């Protein structure tokens, strides 16, 4: 059970949680709930009805039954509250609390399965939701949708509406796959928009119209105007971009990516601080894409990234360096700054290995050294890096203005 | 009659002014005339005596006759007052008001000669006086000197007494020669102490006892107890240490050397401004040492000399110059200074050979100058003098850290 970030070599390898039912255990909200107060339900010559009362457990359909295990024996089911009318949109939201990537969103009921129903996701943590599939026979009418409405490779963020569900009455499930249908799944790991379309941190699906004047018309209701849904399952993982194997509980309770690849984020969504040296692209399953620190040379603590600098390279680096501390300069503090020059004994990476002027001020006709070997301006007659000794062939005056003058013979 | 001081191909040449007798035509000052009050002097059987009156002209003896043209015929002379006591020292005082290289002093007396008397030089304008020569018999009595000491190498500026002008009566002279007896008379050219020796600002001959009981003891004295002189003579040329063909009366009729071979002041003793690069040495006959102006390629006023500087050299060269105007530094002011460049397009001599550092600042990583060539330090991929263009290969990024980034292949 190795680390799957770390390839063997312990090189960078593109990661991700397990898949998961998200929806598992989880606490679902449901806008009714049959039991309260307890009411006979019908269940349909099929008149066997039975009662919900929320209070006595065995009798009871809450919607924790929605997520718990589901065994074809011993089944349990939730069942909304009873004599729906018309207009009536029965609404279960379900709020993961982080950004996942969902392949299917499943429901298996206990009653018939409704003729109008819709699933929706937030992106944004429950405050707007957005179309994800529609179900209706009626598509026009209840949803105003095209039935089978086409999707091309364009507009393939569209929620169809579909006669799919009308196929029953005993039970049955409807199941919704994001990928199926779109053109782009061929290659979904390198897919802008099929990699945003399966995201939410939220679901939520609303049945609107059950499956019915034959007996009395179209108006009122009876026992058997409800829902009952047994197993809710969302099927995707946690949203990571690839940089992260598992998510897990933050400080205070915010699941989060663990993140991997020098990504930090709740989606490893970006780059970790100082390792600017490369743009952060989500890791596919080619290149790991990973975030590789920038170069200081040990003296700056913080970092920058130029994308021209990158696009300049052969997209190679476009790391920059942050007040290169140590009497240092340059993109990566890599050269030694005016007045100073690179000691050569000392290695790059070393505080020290920019060494100051202490140039001889008779000697040298200067006062800034040379940037790399230290050199300064020395006089006509004087040597040394200092300037510092006089050339031989010359003998030392006490002279400032010309000391080290010419022997002649 | 060319130029003594401009050898031939206008090179310098030792000069001194014509030999000459300095005091002709000069006004001599003597303490004792006669003819002040009108008084008879016996001439000596030989008493013949004459009349002396100031006055009268035809019978007056002043002491311009001293200095005036001296022939046989019609000669003409001074004579001192009458009836001297022994005490006495008669002077004549002469002012040249310039320093001279007297070789001889002479006098042709119409009295007899003084038994006594004692030549006297001022190098200082008449203030104080030295012993130049003496003449008596009695030598340790009267000047109490030796007589005819001897003149070693050292103690040659010795003024000697002797016997020589004791030898008569109707007339005669007695000259002095200032060299004559001196060892080091061989090479006055280039003797220190000879060439001081013969140096005068004012001469005084002072007679202190005359030519002389069988009569009448030694008390007293007669008509002939005086002294006369007819002509006067100090030879020599102007003091000008070999720098000047002449002397010639300056501003305000202070005579002075005509000073040549970049010499100045009144002996041209010293370098003329500005030409100090060799010590001012007295010329001799082999090198005219003159005075070379130092270099300081069109970028200094002022001068000045280091005689260790020159000493350093082969006695070639000790000048030095001082704030180097444009932007120029060193002795010569031969380099450009920190912060600029030696304009290479433009000669050294030229007002703006020294030009400025307007280095690129994204370019070049520092902001002085190569002091030759004019390179800046140049960001790793930047060329140029300026570093104001990427080097080929590179390619110009917008960011001033890092411009002309690597095209690889
Ligand atoms: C069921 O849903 C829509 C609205 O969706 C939600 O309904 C509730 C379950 C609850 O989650 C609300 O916050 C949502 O709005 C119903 O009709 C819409 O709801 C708005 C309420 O602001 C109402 O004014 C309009 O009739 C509808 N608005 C828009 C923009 O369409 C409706 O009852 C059901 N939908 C269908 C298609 O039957
Ligand atoms: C003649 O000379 C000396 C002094 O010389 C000068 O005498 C005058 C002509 C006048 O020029 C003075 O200014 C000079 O001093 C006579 O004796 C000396 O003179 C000083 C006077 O200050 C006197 O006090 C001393 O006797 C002498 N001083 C010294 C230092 O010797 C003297 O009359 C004559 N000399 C001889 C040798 O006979
Ligand atoms: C430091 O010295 C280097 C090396 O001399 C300077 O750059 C060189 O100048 C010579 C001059 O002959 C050229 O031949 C080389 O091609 C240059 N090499 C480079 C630019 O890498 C440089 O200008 C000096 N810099 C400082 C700050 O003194
Ligand atoms: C100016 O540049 C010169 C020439 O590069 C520097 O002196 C030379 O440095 C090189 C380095 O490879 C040596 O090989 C030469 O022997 C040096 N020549 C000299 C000293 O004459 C000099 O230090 C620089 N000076 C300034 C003010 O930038
Ligand atoms: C119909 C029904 O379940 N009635 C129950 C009663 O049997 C029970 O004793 C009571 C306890 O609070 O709650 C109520
Ligand atoms: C002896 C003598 O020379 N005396 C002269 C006199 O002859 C002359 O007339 C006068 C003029 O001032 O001066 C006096
Ligand atoms: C529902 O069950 C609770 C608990 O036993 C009880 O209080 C209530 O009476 C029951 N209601 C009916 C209608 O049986
Ligand atoms: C000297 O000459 C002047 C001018 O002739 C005269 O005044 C004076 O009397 C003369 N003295 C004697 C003593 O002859
Ligand atoms: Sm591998
Ligand atoms: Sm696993
Ligand atoms: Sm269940
Ligand atoms: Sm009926
Ligand atoms: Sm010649
Ligand atoms: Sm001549
Ligand atoms: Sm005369
Ligand atoms: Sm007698």
Avoid at 327 to 337: F, S, V
């Amino acid at each position: 059970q190795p680390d799957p970030c770390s390839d063997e070599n312990g090189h960078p390898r593109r990661c991700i949680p397990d898949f998961v039912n998200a929806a598992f255990g989880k606490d679902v909200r449901v806008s009714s709930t049959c039991g309260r107060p307890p009411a006979r339900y019908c269940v349909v010559r099929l008149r066997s009805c039975h009662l919900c009362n929320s209070s006595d457990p065995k009798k009871a359909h809450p919607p924790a039954f929605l997520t718990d295990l589901n065994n074809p024996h011993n089944l349990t089911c939730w069942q909304s509250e009873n004599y729906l009318q018309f207009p009536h949109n029965v609404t279960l939201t379900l709020s993961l609390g982080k950004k996942f990537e969902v392949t299917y969103v499943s429901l298996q009921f206990c009653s018939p399965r409704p003729e109008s129903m819709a699933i929706y996701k937030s992106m944004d943590y429950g405050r707007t939701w957005v179309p994800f599939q529609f179900y209706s026979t009626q598509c026009r009418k209840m949803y105003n949708r095209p039935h089978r409405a086409p999707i091309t490779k364009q507009n393939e963020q569209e929620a169809v509406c579909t006669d799919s569900h009308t196929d029953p009455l005993s039970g049955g499930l409807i199941a919704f796959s994001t990928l199926d249908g779109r053109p782009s799944a061929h290659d979904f790991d390198n897919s802008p928009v099929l990699q945003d379309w399966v995201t939410a941190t939220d679901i939520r699906v609303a049945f609107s119209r059950l499956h019915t004047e034959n007996e009395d018309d179209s108006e009122l209701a009876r026992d058997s105007y409800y829902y009952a849904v047994s197993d809710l399952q969302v099927g995707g993982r946690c949203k990571c971009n690839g940089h992260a194997a598992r998510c897990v509980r933050d400080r205070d309770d915010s699941l989060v990516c663990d993140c991997r690849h020098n990504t930090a984020g709740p989606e490893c969504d970006r780059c970790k601080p100082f390792h600017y040296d490369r743009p952060w692209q989500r890791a596919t399953a080619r290149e790991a894409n990973e975030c590789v620190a920038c170069n200081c040379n040990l003296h700056a603590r913080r970092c920058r990234f130029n994308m021209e600098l990158y696009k300049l390279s052969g997209r190679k680096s476009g790391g920059v360096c942050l007040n290169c501390r140590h009497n240092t300069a340059g993109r990566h503090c890599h050269y030694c700054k005016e007045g100073f020059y690179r000691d050569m004994g000392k290695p790059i990476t070393h505080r020290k290995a920019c060494k100051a002027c202490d140039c001889h001020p008779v000697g040298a006709a200067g006062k800034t050294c040379n940037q790399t070997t230290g050199q300064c301006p020395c006089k006509d007659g004087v040597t040394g890096i200092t300037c510092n000794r006089c050339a031989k062939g010359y003998q030392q005056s006490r002279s400032p203005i010309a000391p080290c003058i010419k022997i002649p013979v």
